[PDB]
Design a protein around this ligand. Structure first.
Ligand code: ADP
Ligand code: MG
Lengths: 98, 426, 523, 78
């Protein structure tokens, strides 16, 4: 079991971020690079050796996107969302995660 | 230039439209029988936008009043300053709509809308540069949905490129008038997201609790209802009717209100809301009125902005004030309450001001902006549309005039597609 | 002005009901808090009509008058008088209210004697000038020989806490109040003594902590206790900085560059934590909130992280550890760190608090008030606040006078000696000033149930021939020596009782017309 | 013997054309824009100076910057 406080979604920063599209092939470089971004996040999770993920409940941005949900199901990984921020003290003392 | 012809079509459109010109004739100082009573170019320059000057000094409002009822529009004939319009801007209808969408399109609309288009043509002769049209109607009305949906489609055959700023009175989730109100609300919006660009949402029955709690009215009526709606109508057309530093007409409002053209349902409102006795015992400052529009106490519709997220925020102030304090106050809310605003827009709240004070109030602001508050209201309309159509209740009232069972199926598929259209960024 | 009234909804009165409403409204304020004066006086319970009434029992006269909401115009002068007495010296707010009311009660007796009210004002100015010389000549200073000054400080806290709810706790709460100001070793800031109120246990279970207590417990995966640590606090932002450039966006051409920017954002947030741990610390206190990304960095290095203590909580940690705020981390040789011995977590009332045991240069305290109900904890906090404020000014002004009714008989004797050396116009006003000063030992004697007609008469006969330290003994109900029993008060507290009551009674007595305007929203 | 300058201009720092968007790409040019906003206002004050106009009158408001500049150069404004 691993407790993850990172949001497996599209890349966004705390500052205002925008994508400028001014080319025909630039629309292909937006969708295919977003799929290659979260695939490096799933393969970093899968090569660690965990099977149960506990994602903290995010409010500002989306914690687990629909693109990230499909890669974690093919890696045979049980994903649990909506873990509250006040409950992470009880989880890390019980299972022993960080 | 940039002339706008006003079309008040429907039973609820003429009641709002009767007090819509009472605010414009009082703020501009336009005499109904004289020439003018203005003071400078803040009021006398923008007369030609909404009025056509006749020979001699008499001003005529660019307004078309459409109604399928003789008795309803007779109050705007010789009532509260209703003798100032053109005589051909009083198109009566001897056959009532009967709160039916199919009757106003195929029976009443097949014989009247060729004559209603002639009134827009005669008004456009005095327009040197037509900016667009506005349309005030209702979803729970027969003429507002019959002569509001068919009129907005035939006007695109002659004006395909001009902008549109429709005003829609949404039905109430609290009380109901008839069981065909989910039928009339689904059919009118289904042809409204097709080729329009602006549509507001005003709930009249939701304002009865605002007048009872805030405006201190014991027994409200329709006369007290349309008073604060006219303050919301004048707040949007403030920089359009008065010059200033933050120049933003309807052409600049059509772009900076919607990032996407389909999700064009806004939530109008204004601030402050004072009674007739407690108004003079209250001071109005810049952070007082700017922080009141975001709460749920200043909404014109039965919605909840405390569980939603906005996309574009525009505010127009009334009075000579320092507009640099508006941007600094709203930027501090975007950092502590970032779940309610947009994360990639550095200036979400736009600024607008004029130098003309309103009637009664000293300072006043209006709230124009879209959010996900229309998403929770569109689910209740499709919920009532699902239970009535599955039993096929009262379908012979619609299919007997020219509709079919496949007409409601396509009206249900795309209206539920609009629910998933707002469900992406929620 | 009543005849042919030129007002709309406003009314007034001149010289008939003006002084009538002023004397009724001021005596009823003084007779209200009359039963709360002295070491045997009862307390009041303040309640509202509803809508979160929030009952708050108080014996101090300032907290009673600031919440009652008197509608009388002249009574608001005595209400505001007790507010200034709590803000300056923090004691004698009940004593200055009865004394200002007993002056106007004697001024009501001069109504039927046809005495001019300006003669009473000029007669009381000479009476107050003679009363300042009685307290100034009887003040006992304390310079060197500090073993008698610490005994004198316990007599100040023993006199203040005797008139409060802490009656049979003078063996404990006196040491909790004297040693709290004694651990300040400087200015009386009155904010380093953080009082924590917890339910459960009796008032004898309350204690003064040798270190410091805090909330917002140490992280998630961080150590709970580090021995011999270096405490470094901060007042900087940890995550989601948005650093001081309003109108700055990330305008890129592809989503692969957004992944490089957000990795560069987390590298600069990691580099900020790496500049913190170069000092060689084990604990971290931030005034702002600490998010999840720097929390993992402090937990991996074995460093504590206390997030969002208080705005004034980092000031108490800076006074109890001997460090600095250190909001910028770019010079490790110019940042002073704190010192401690144990940062273990203690449990007080089923709540884990962070105990900073064994801190160096600890000029801050933490009083852990434990009571039976919340009404006792709200009363014992105000009772300790009325005791710590006098000791914070006694260390700045070491002049003390003998209380317990002894100071008022010395003040009334100096007025009576000069009342016989004046002509008969102002001598009657000075005799009423001396009778009002003798009412303050009369209210204390009658609250216990003693014979107030004889004990004040014995105090007047004692002070007439010697006996400058003779006062009222409330223990047995007789006359005793105040220097032997050890019932003393501060000079600045007793001076503000005399001076503010004479100035407030000067304002109300000089009012001959009360013209009240038309109120708003009252019909 | 003073000279009076009658103006219809704003002597404030926040004089904006209400539609200007200064998009910058680097921090070396970002500081040059902030230095340019002060040099626009200070160039107008140098035109009022070196002319003898010790008394300045304007129907438009004047901020704290141009008020303190005339106090250092011993000039009056309104
Ligand atoms: N041990 C004691 N012996 C005699 N008198 C005492 C003793 N303790 C307190 N008093 C008297 O009780 C009075 C309490 O006054 P208090 O209500 O504390 O005034 P304030 O409200 O201004 O603080 C003091 O004036 C003091 O003279
Ligand atoms: Mg006291």
């Amino acid at each position: 079991i691993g407790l993850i406080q990172f949001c497996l979604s599209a890349p966004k920063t705390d500052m205002d971020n925008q994508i400028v599209v001014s080319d025909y092939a630039q629309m292909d470089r937006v969708l295919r690079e977003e799929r290659a971004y979260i695939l490096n996040l799933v393969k970093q999770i899968k090569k660690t050796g965990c099977n149960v993920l506990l994602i903290q409940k995010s409010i500002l941005r989306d914690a687990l996107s629909d693109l990230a949900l499909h890669f974690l199901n093919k890696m045979k990984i049980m994903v649990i969302k909506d873990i509250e921020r006040e409950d992470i003290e009880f989880i890390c003392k019980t299972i022993g995660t960080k | 230039m940039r002339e706008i012809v006003h079309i008040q079509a429907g039973q609820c459109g003429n009641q709002i439209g009767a007090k819509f010109w009472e605010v414009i004739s009082d703020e501009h100082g336009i005499d109904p029988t004289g020439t003018y009573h203005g003071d400078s170019d803040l009021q006398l320059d923008r007369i030609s936008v909404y009025y056509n000057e006749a020979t001699g000094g008499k001003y005529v409002p660019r307004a078309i009043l459409v109604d399928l009822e003789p008795g309803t529009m007779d109050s705007v004939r010789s009532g509260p300053f209703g003798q100032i319009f053109r005589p051909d801007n009083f198109v009566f209808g001897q056959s009532g709509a009967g709160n039916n969408w199919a009757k106003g399109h195929y029976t009443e609309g097949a014989e009247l809308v060729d004559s209603v288009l002639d009134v827009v043509r005669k008004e456009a002769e005095s327009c040197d540069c037509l900016q667009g049209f506005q349309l005030t109607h209702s979803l729970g009305g027969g003429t507002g949905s019959g002569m509001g949906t068919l009129l907005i489609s035939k006007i695109r055959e002659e004006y395909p490129d001009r902008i549109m700023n429709t005003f829609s009175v949404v039905p109430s989730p609290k009380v109901s008038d008839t069981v065909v109100e989910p039928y009339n609300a689904t059919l009118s919006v289904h042809q409204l997201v097709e080729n329009t660009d602006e549509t507001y949402c005003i709930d009249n029955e939701a304002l009865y609790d605002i007048c009872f709690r805030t405006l201190k009215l014991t027994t409200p009526t329709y006369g007290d209802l349309n008073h604060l709606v006219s303050a919301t109508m004048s707040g949007v057309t403030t920089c359009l009717r008065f010059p200033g530093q933050l120049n933003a007409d309807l052409r600049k409002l059509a772009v900076n209100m919607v990032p996407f053209p389909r999700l064009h349902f806004f939530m109008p409102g204004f601030a402050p809301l004072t009674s007739r006795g407690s108004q003079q015992y209250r001071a109005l400052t810049v952070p007082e009125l700017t922080q009141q529009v975001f709460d749920a106490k200043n909404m014109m519709a039965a919605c909840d902005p405390r569980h939603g997220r906005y996309l574009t925020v525009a505010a127009v102030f009334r009075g000579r004030m320092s507009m640099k304090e508006v941007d600094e106050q709203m930027l501090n809310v975007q950092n502590k309450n970032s779940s309610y605003f947009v994360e990639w827009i550095p200036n979400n709240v736009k600024t607008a001001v004029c130098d003309i004070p309103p009637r009664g109030l000293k300072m006043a602001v209006t709230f124009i902006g879209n959010s996900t508050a229309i998403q929770e209201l569109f689910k209740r309309i499709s919920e009532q549309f699902t239970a009535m159509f599955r039993r096929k209740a009262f379908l012979h009232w619609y299919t007997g005039e020219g509709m079919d069972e496949m007409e409601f199926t396509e009206a249900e598929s795309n209206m539920n597609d609009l629910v998933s259209e707002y469900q992406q960024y929620q | 002005a009543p005849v042919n009234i030129f007002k709309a909804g406003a009314d007034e009165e001149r010289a008939e009901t003006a002084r009538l409403t002023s004397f009724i409204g001021a005596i009823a304020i003084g007779d209200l808090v009359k039963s709360t004066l002295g070491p045997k006086g009862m307390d009041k319970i303040l309640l509202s009509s509803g809508r979160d009434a929030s009952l708050m029992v108080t014996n101090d006269g300032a907290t009673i008058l600031k919440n009652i909401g008197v509608d009388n115009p002249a009574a608001k002068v005595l209400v505001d008088m007790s507010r200034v007495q709590d803000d300056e010296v923090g004691d004698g707010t009940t004593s200055v209210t009865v004394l200002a009311a007993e002056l106007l009660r004697e001024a009501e007796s001069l109504i039927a004697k046809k005495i001019h009210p300006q003669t009473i004002i000029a007669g009381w100015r000479e009476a107050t000038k003679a009363a300042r010389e009685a307290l100034l000549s009887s003040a006992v200073d304390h310079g060197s020989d500090e073993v008698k000054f610490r005994q004198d400080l316990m007599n100040i806290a023993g006199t203040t806490l005797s008139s409060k709810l802490l009656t049979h706790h003078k063996d404990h709460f006196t040491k909790l109040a004297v040693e709290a100001v004694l651990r300040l070793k400087g200015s009386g800031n009155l904010e380093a003594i953080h009082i924590i109120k917890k339910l459960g246990g009796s008032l004898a279970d309350s204690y003064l902590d040798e270190g410091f207590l805090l909330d917002k417990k140490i992280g998630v995966n961080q150590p709970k206790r580090i021995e011999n640590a270096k405490i470094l606090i901060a007042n900087t932002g940890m995550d989601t900085d948005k650093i001081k450039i309003f109108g700055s966006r990330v305008r890129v051409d592809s989503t692969a560059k957004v992944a490089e920017i957000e990795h560069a954002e987390k590298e600069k947030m990691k580099e900020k934590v790496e500049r913190i741990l170069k000092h060689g610390i084990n604990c971290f206190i931030n005034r702002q909130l600490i998010y999840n990304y720097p929390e993992q960095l402090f937990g991996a290095a074995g460093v504590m992280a206390i997030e969002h203590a208080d705005f004034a909580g980092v000031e108490r940690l800076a006074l109890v550890t001997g460090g600095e705020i250190a909001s910028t981390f770019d010079h490790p040789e110019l940042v002073k760190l704190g010192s401690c011995k144990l940062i273990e977590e203690v449990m007080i009332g089923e709540d884990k608090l962070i105990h900073f045991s064994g801190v160096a240069l600890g000029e801050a305290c933490t009083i852990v008030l434990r009571g039976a109900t919340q009404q006792i904890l709200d009363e014992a906090e105000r009772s300790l606040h009325d005791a710590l404020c006098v000791l914070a000014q006694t260390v700045k002004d070491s002049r003390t006078v003998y209380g317990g009714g002894c100071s008022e008989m010395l003040m009334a004797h100096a007025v009576t000696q000069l009342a016989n050396r004046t002509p008969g116009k102002e001598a009657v006003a000075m005799e009423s000033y001396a009778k009002a000063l003798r009412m303050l030992p009369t209210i204390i004697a009658d609250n216990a149930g003693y014979d107030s007609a004889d004990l004040v008469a014995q105090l007047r006969a004692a002070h007439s021939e010697g006996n400058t330290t003779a006062g009222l003994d409330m223990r047995e109900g007789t006359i005793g020596d105040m220097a032997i029993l050890g019932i003393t008060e501060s000079f600045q507290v007793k001076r503000q009782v005399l001076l503010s009551a004479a100035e407030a009674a000067e304002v109300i007595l000089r009012v001959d017309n009360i013209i009240k305007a038309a109120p708003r929203k009252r019909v | 013997n003073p000279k009076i300058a009658l103006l219809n201009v704003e002597l404030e720092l926040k004089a904006e054309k209400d539609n200007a968007e200064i998009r910058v790409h680097t921090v070396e040019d970002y500081q040059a824009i902030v230095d340019a906003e002060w040099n626009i206002l200070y160039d107008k004050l140098e035109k009022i100076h070196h002319s003898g106009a010790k008394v300045v009158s304007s129907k438009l408001p004047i901020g704290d910057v141009a008020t303190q500049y005339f106090a250092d150069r011993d000039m009056f404004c309104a």
